[PDB]
Design an enzyme around this catalytic site. Structure first.
Site, short mmCIF file in Angstrom:
data_model
loop_
_atom_site.label_atom_id
_atom_site.label_comp_id
_atom_site.label_asym_id
_atom_site.label_seq_id
_atom_site.Cartn_x
_atom_site.Cartn_y
_atom_site.Cartn_z
N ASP A 39 5.72 -33.47 -7.86
CA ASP A 39 6.56 -32.77 -6.86
C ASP A 39 7.20 -33.74 -5.86
O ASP A 39 7.33 -34.93 -6.20
CB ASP A 39 5.70 -31.73 -6.13
CG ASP A 39 6.37 -30.38 -6.07
OD1 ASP A 39 7.58 -30.35 -5.75
OD2 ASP A 39 5.69 -29.38 -6.36
N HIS A 69 8.78 -28.73 -0.55
CA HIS A 69 8.60 -28.13 -1.89
C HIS A 69 7.17 -28.40 -2.38
O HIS A 69 6.48 -27.42 -2.72
CB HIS A 69 9.65 -28.68 -2.86
CG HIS A 69 10.18 -27.71 -3.87
ND1 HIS A 69 9.80 -27.75 -5.21
CD2 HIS A 69 11.06 -26.68 -3.75
CE1 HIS A 69 10.42 -26.80 -5.87
NE2 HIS A 69 11.20 -26.12 -5.00
N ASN A 161 14.20 -21.06 -12.91
CA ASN A 161 14.67 -19.92 -12.09
C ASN A 161 16.09 -19.53 -12.52
O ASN A 161 16.85 -19.05 -11.65
CB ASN A 161 14.60 -20.29 -10.61
CG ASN A 161 13.24 -20.82 -10.20
OD1 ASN A 161 12.23 -20.21 -10.49
ND2 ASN A 161 13.21 -21.96 -9.52
N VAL A 177 2.17 -27.10 -23.57
CA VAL A 177 1.84 -26.92 -22.12
C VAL A 177 2.00 -25.44 -21.72
O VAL A 177 2.71 -24.71 -22.44
CB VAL A 177 2.68 -27.85 -21.21
CG1 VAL A 177 2.58 -29.30 -21.65
CG2 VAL A 177 4.15 -27.44 -21.12
N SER A 224 8.50 -21.90 -9.63
CA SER A 224 7.87 -23.03 -8.91
C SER A 224 6.67 -22.59 -8.07
O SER A 224 5.90 -23.48 -7.67
CB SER A 224 8.87 -23.70 -8.02
OG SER A 224 8.22 -24.53 -7.07
N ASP A 260 1.53 -4.90 -17.70
CA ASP A 260 1.58 -4.42 -16.29
C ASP A 260 2.95 -4.70 -15.65
O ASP A 260 3.28 -4.03 -14.65
CB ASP A 260 0.46 -5.05 -15.45
CG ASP A 260 -0.86 -4.28 -15.44
OD1 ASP A 260 -0.92 -3.19 -16.06
OD2 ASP A 260 -1.81 -4.77 -14.79
CA LIG Z 1 6.38 -25.61 -4.14
CA LIG Z 2 7.49 -27.73 -5.92
CA LIG Z 3 7.66 -24.13 -3.14
#
Ligand SMILES: [Ca+2]
Ligand SMILES: [Ca+2]
Ligand SMILES: [Ca+2]
Ligand SMILES: [Ca+2]
Length: 279
Positions: A39, A69, A161, A177, A224, A260
Protein backbone atom coordinates in the site's frame (compact mmCIF):
# COMPACT_ATOMS: atom_id res chain seq x y z
CA UNK A 1 -15.51 -11.42 22.61
CA UNK A 2 -18.06 -8.67 21.64
CA UNK A 3 -17.19 -5.10 20.39
CA UNK A 4 -20.48 -3.09 20.71
CA UNK A 5 -21.15 -0.20 18.25
CA UNK A 6 -18.38 -1.55 15.93
CA UNK A 7 -18.17 -0.50 12.26
CA UNK A 8 -20.94 -2.22 10.14
CA UNK A 9 -18.27 -4.29 8.29
CA UNK A 10 -16.82 -5.97 11.44
CA UNK A 11 -20.41 -6.64 12.74
CA UNK A 12 -21.33 -8.17 9.28
CA UNK A 13 -18.29 -10.61 9.10
CA UNK A 14 -19.48 -12.03 12.50
CA UNK A 15 -23.17 -12.21 11.38
CA UNK A 16 -25.61 -14.51 9.51
CA UNK A 17 -27.75 -11.34 9.04
CA UNK A 18 -27.12 -7.69 8.09
CA UNK A 19 -28.23 -4.72 10.26
CA UNK A 20 -26.36 -5.58 13.52
CA UNK A 21 -23.52 -3.37 14.94
CA UNK A 22 -21.75 -5.82 17.37
CA UNK A 23 -18.48 -7.49 16.19
CA UNK A 24 -18.13 -10.96 17.89
CA UNK A 25 -14.67 -12.67 17.64
CA UNK A 26 -12.43 -15.21 19.50
CA UNK A 27 -10.30 -13.05 21.90
CA UNK A 28 -7.14 -14.69 20.38
CA UNK A 29 -7.88 -12.04 17.67
CA UNK A 30 -5.19 -13.16 15.17
CA UNK A 31 -2.28 -12.91 17.74
CA UNK A 32 1.00 -14.44 16.40
CA UNK A 33 -0.15 -13.97 12.74
CA UNK A 34 1.30 -11.19 10.48
CA UNK A 35 -0.64 -9.21 7.79
CA UNK A 36 1.59 -7.38 5.25
CA UNK A 37 -0.33 -4.27 4.00
CA UNK A 38 1.12 -3.61 0.48
CA UNK A 39 0.00 0.00 0.00
CA UNK A 40 0.94 3.73 0.50
CA UNK A 41 2.56 2.76 3.89
CA UNK A 42 1.12 2.84 7.49
CA UNK A 43 1.14 5.62 10.14
CA UNK A 44 2.51 3.05 12.68
CA UNK A 45 2.23 5.69 15.47
CA UNK A 46 -1.66 5.80 15.34
CA UNK A 47 -2.94 5.00 18.87
CA UNK A 48 -5.26 2.46 17.07
CA UNK A 49 -2.30 0.14 16.17
CA UNK A 50 -1.08 0.00 19.84
CA UNK A 51 2.49 -0.43 18.46
CA UNK A 52 1.53 -3.65 16.57
CA UNK A 53 2.24 -1.76 13.26
CA UNK A 54 5.64 -0.97 11.70
CA UNK A 55 6.96 -0.03 8.22
CA UNK A 56 9.33 -2.84 7.05
CA UNK A 57 9.96 -1.60 3.44
CA UNK A 58 9.54 1.47 1.16
CA UNK A 59 10.54 2.17 -2.50
CA UNK A 60 10.28 6.01 -1.89
CA UNK A 61 12.16 8.78 0.03
CA UNK A 62 9.92 8.17 3.14
CA UNK A 63 8.21 5.00 4.53
CA UNK A 64 5.58 7.32 6.17
CA UNK A 65 1.97 7.17 4.83
CA UNK A 66 1.40 10.71 3.39
CA UNK A 67 -1.68 9.38 1.46
CA UNK A 68 -3.85 7.59 4.10
CA UNK A 69 -4.99 4.71 1.80
CA UNK A 70 -2.57 2.18 3.46
CA UNK A 71 -3.11 3.54 7.05
CA UNK A 72 -6.88 2.93 6.46
CA UNK A 73 -6.44 -0.67 5.07
CA UNK A 74 -3.96 -1.67 7.85
CA UNK A 75 -6.67 -0.33 10.25
CA UNK A 76 -9.44 -2.55 8.78
CA UNK A 77 -6.96 -5.50 9.11
CA UNK A 78 -5.81 -5.13 12.76
CA UNK A 79 -6.63 -1.74 14.40
CA UNK A 80 -8.10 -2.16 17.94
CA UNK A 81 -11.46 -0.43 17.06
CA UNK A 82 -11.76 -0.91 13.24
CA UNK A 83 -9.66 -4.12 12.68
CA UNK A 84 -10.83 -7.74 12.09
CA UNK A 85 -7.68 -9.29 13.72
CA UNK A 86 -7.29 -6.87 16.71
CA UNK A 87 -4.03 -8.58 17.92
CA UNK A 88 -2.33 -9.32 14.50
CA UNK A 89 1.12 -7.82 13.57
CA UNK A 90 0.87 -5.29 10.68
CA UNK A 91 3.85 -4.88 8.31
CA UNK A 92 3.59 -1.87 5.98
CA UNK A 93 5.26 -2.29 2.54
CA UNK A 94 5.11 1.10 0.75
CA UNK A 95 4.87 0.27 -3.03
CA UNK A 96 2.45 3.24 -3.65
CA UNK A 97 3.64 6.93 -3.46
CA UNK A 98 1.61 9.48 -1.40
CA UNK A 99 -0.51 10.25 -4.56
CA UNK A 100 -1.63 6.55 -4.21
CA UNK A 101 -0.04 5.37 -7.52
CA UNK A 102 3.09 3.25 -8.29
CA UNK A 103 5.02 1.55 -11.16
CA UNK A 104 4.16 -2.20 -11.74
CA UNK A 105 7.91 -3.11 -11.39
CA UNK A 106 7.90 -1.57 -7.82
CA UNK A 107 4.58 -3.38 -6.82
CA UNK A 108 6.13 -6.70 -8.09
CA UNK A 109 9.35 -5.94 -6.08
CA UNK A 110 7.10 -5.41 -3.00
CA UNK A 111 5.21 -8.72 -3.41
CA UNK A 112 8.59 -10.55 -3.82
CA UNK A 113 9.92 -8.58 -0.75
CA UNK A 114 7.06 -10.02 1.45
CA UNK A 115 7.62 -13.61 0.10
CA UNK A 116 11.20 -13.24 1.51
CA UNK A 117 10.68 -10.71 4.38
CA UNK A 118 8.32 -13.16 6.16
CA UNK A 119 11.45 -15.31 6.88
CA UNK A 120 12.69 -12.23 8.90
CA UNK A 121 9.42 -12.02 10.99
CA UNK A 122 7.80 -13.93 13.90
CA UNK A 123 4.46 -15.14 12.42
CA UNK A 124 4.04 -18.64 13.97
CA UNK A 125 0.27 -18.62 13.16
CA UNK A 126 1.15 -17.68 9.52
CA UNK A 127 1.45 -14.74 7.06
CA UNK A 128 -1.26 -12.73 5.17
CA UNK A 129 -0.78 -9.99 2.50
CA UNK A 130 -3.54 -7.37 1.78
CA UNK A 131 -3.14 -5.88 -1.76
CA UNK A 132 -5.76 -3.09 -1.87
CA UNK A 133 -4.24 -1.90 -5.21
CA UNK A 134 -5.00 -2.72 -8.89
CA UNK A 135 -4.85 -1.74 -12.58
CA UNK A 136 -5.05 -3.36 -16.08
CA UNK A 137 -4.15 -7.06 -16.62
CA UNK A 138 -0.40 -7.95 -16.34
CA UNK A 139 0.78 -11.64 -16.36
CA UNK A 140 3.94 -10.19 -14.63
CA UNK A 141 1.89 -8.68 -11.69
CA UNK A 142 -0.36 -11.84 -11.61
CA UNK A 143 2.86 -14.02 -11.47
CA UNK A 144 4.12 -11.90 -8.48
CA UNK A 145 0.84 -12.48 -6.52
CA UNK A 146 1.05 -16.21 -7.54
CA UNK A 147 4.69 -16.38 -6.20
CA UNK A 148 3.79 -14.57 -2.89
CA UNK A 149 0.88 -17.08 -2.45
CA UNK A 150 3.16 -20.07 -3.43
CA UNK A 151 5.77 -18.85 -0.82
CA UNK A 152 3.13 -19.57 1.92
CA UNK A 153 1.40 -16.14 2.31
CA UNK A 154 -2.42 -15.91 2.04
CA UNK A 155 -2.77 -13.19 -0.65
CA UNK A 156 -6.01 -11.11 -0.55
CA UNK A 157 -6.37 -8.71 -3.55
CA UNK A 158 -9.15 -6.19 -4.39
CA UNK A 159 -11.25 -7.21 -7.44
CA UNK A 160 -11.09 -3.49 -8.51
CA UNK A 161 -13.69 -0.67 -8.38
CA UNK A 162 -14.42 -0.62 -12.17
CA UNK A 163 -17.91 -2.34 -11.98
CA UNK A 164 -16.56 -4.67 -14.75
CA UNK A 165 -15.29 -8.30 -14.85
CA UNK A 166 -12.04 -8.47 -12.75
CA UNK A 167 -10.53 -10.82 -15.46
CA UNK A 168 -9.07 -7.63 -17.09
CA UNK A 169 -7.29 -6.37 -13.87
CA UNK A 170 -4.14 -7.43 -11.92
CA UNK A 171 -3.47 -8.84 -9.44
CA UNK A 172 -7.31 -9.32 -9.21
CA UNK A 173 -7.31 -11.76 -12.26
CA UNK A 174 -4.61 -14.12 -10.73
CA UNK A 175 -6.31 -17.55 -10.18
CA UNK A 176 -4.16 -18.70 -7.16
CA UNK A 177 -4.79 -15.58 -4.87
CA UNK A 178 -8.02 -14.50 -2.98
CA UNK A 179 -9.94 -11.93 -5.17
CA UNK A 180 -12.33 -9.86 -2.97
CA UNK A 181 -15.47 -8.04 -4.24
CA UNK A 182 -17.22 -5.36 -2.12
CA UNK A 183 -20.68 -5.48 -0.41
CA UNK A 184 -22.55 -2.54 1.32
CA UNK A 185 -24.39 -2.58 4.73
CA UNK A 186 -27.70 -3.68 3.04
CA UNK A 187 -25.94 -6.80 1.56
CA UNK A 188 -25.95 -5.34 -2.01
CA UNK A 189 -22.88 -5.62 -4.29
CA UNK A 190 -21.19 -2.18 -3.95
CA UNK A 191 -22.08 -0.28 -7.19
CA UNK A 192 -18.31 0.04 -7.94
CA UNK A 193 -17.37 -3.62 -7.12
CA UNK A 194 -15.70 -5.71 -9.90
CA UNK A 195 -17.31 -9.17 -10.44
CA UNK A 196 -16.74 -12.35 -12.50
CA UNK A 197 -15.74 -16.04 -12.16
CA UNK A 198 -12.25 -14.99 -10.87
CA UNK A 199 -13.84 -13.54 -7.63
CA UNK A 200 -13.54 -15.96 -4.63
CA UNK A 201 -15.33 -13.92 -1.87
CA UNK A 202 -17.08 -10.60 -0.92
CA UNK A 203 -16.19 -8.35 2.04
CA UNK A 204 -17.80 -5.18 3.43
CA UNK A 205 -16.70 -2.49 0.90
CA UNK A 206 -19.03 0.58 1.13
CA UNK A 207 -18.72 3.29 3.88
CA UNK A 208 -15.87 1.44 5.75
CA UNK A 209 -14.87 3.37 8.93
CA UNK A 210 -11.13 2.88 9.80
CA UNK A 211 -7.86 4.65 10.85
CA UNK A 212 -6.41 7.66 8.91
CA UNK A 213 -3.14 9.73 8.94
CA UNK A 214 -2.76 12.48 11.60
CA UNK A 215 -3.97 9.85 14.14
CA UNK A 216 -7.56 10.46 12.81
CA UNK A 217 -10.48 8.32 11.38
CA UNK A 218 -12.68 8.52 8.22
CA UNK A 219 -15.04 6.36 6.09
CA UNK A 220 -14.01 5.38 2.49
CA UNK A 221 -15.56 2.90 -0.02
CA UNK A 222 -13.86 0.37 -2.35
CA UNK A 223 -12.93 -3.28 -3.02
CA UNK A 224 -9.77 -1.84 -1.36
CA UNK A 225 -11.71 -1.94 1.99
CA UNK A 226 -13.34 -5.36 1.35
CA UNK A 227 -9.78 -6.79 0.94
CA UNK A 228 -8.43 -5.80 4.43
CA UNK A 229 -11.66 -7.32 5.92
CA UNK A 230 -10.83 -10.67 4.16
CA UNK A 231 -7.07 -10.16 4.88
CA UNK A 232 -7.98 -9.64 8.55
CA UNK A 233 -10.37 -12.66 8.67
CA UNK A 234 -7.63 -14.99 7.20
CA UNK A 235 -5.22 -13.74 9.95
CA UNK A 236 -7.99 -14.42 12.56
CA UNK A 237 -8.83 -17.90 11.08
CA UNK A 238 -5.12 -18.89 10.81
CA UNK A 239 -4.40 -17.97 14.52
CA UNK A 240 -7.47 -20.13 15.45
CA UNK A 241 -5.63 -22.89 13.48
CA UNK A 242 -8.92 -23.15 11.45
CA UNK A 243 -7.06 -22.82 8.07
CA UNK A 244 -3.56 -22.23 6.52
CA UNK A 245 -2.00 -19.60 4.16
CA UNK A 246 -2.60 -21.87 1.11
CA UNK A 247 -6.22 -23.03 1.82
CA UNK A 248 -7.50 -19.89 3.69
CA UNK A 249 -9.31 -18.34 0.65
CA UNK A 250 -11.08 -21.72 -0.02
CA UNK A 251 -11.92 -22.07 3.73
CA UNK A 252 -13.28 -18.44 3.86
CA UNK A 253 -15.46 -19.27 0.75
CA UNK A 254 -16.66 -22.66 2.19
CA UNK A 255 -17.70 -20.96 5.50
CA UNK A 256 -19.13 -17.76 3.80
CA UNK A 257 -22.73 -16.42 4.02
CA UNK A 258 -24.11 -17.87 0.70
CA UNK A 259 -26.85 -16.28 -1.50
CA UNK A 260 -27.18 -13.33 0.95
CA UNK A 261 -25.98 -10.60 -1.57
CA UNK A 262 -28.19 -8.97 -4.28
CA UNK A 263 -27.11 -7.64 -7.75
CA UNK A 264 -24.41 -10.41 -8.01
CA UNK A 265 -23.81 -11.13 -11.74
CA UNK A 266 -24.67 -14.70 -12.84
CA UNK A 267 -21.42 -16.76 -12.66
CA UNK A 268 -19.96 -14.58 -9.86
CA UNK A 269 -19.87 -16.31 -6.41
CA UNK A 270 -22.52 -15.08 -3.88
CA UNK A 271 -20.19 -15.46 -0.84
CA UNK A 272 -19.81 -12.85 1.98
CA UNK A 273 -16.79 -13.25 4.34
CA UNK A 274 -18.02 -14.80 7.67
CA UNK A 275 -15.83 -15.54 10.75
CA UNK A 276 -18.46 -18.25 11.68
CA UNK A 277 -17.75 -17.33 15.38
CA UNK A 278 -20.31 -18.65 17.96
CA UNK A 279 -19.93 -16.61 21.23
CA1 LIG B 1 -7.13 1.35 2.45
CA1 LIG C 1 -5.14 0.79 0.30
CA1 LIG D 1 -8.79 2.76 2.16
CA1 LIG E 1 -21.15 2.46 10.53
Amino acid sequence: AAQTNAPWGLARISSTSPGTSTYYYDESAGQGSCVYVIDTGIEASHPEFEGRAQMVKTYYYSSRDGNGHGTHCAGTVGSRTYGVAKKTQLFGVKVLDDNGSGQYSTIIAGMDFVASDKNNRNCPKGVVASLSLGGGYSSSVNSAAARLQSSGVMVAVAAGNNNADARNYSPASEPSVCTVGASDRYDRRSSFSNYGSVLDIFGPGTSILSTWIGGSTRSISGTSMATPHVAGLAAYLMTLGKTTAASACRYIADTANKGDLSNIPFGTVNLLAYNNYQA
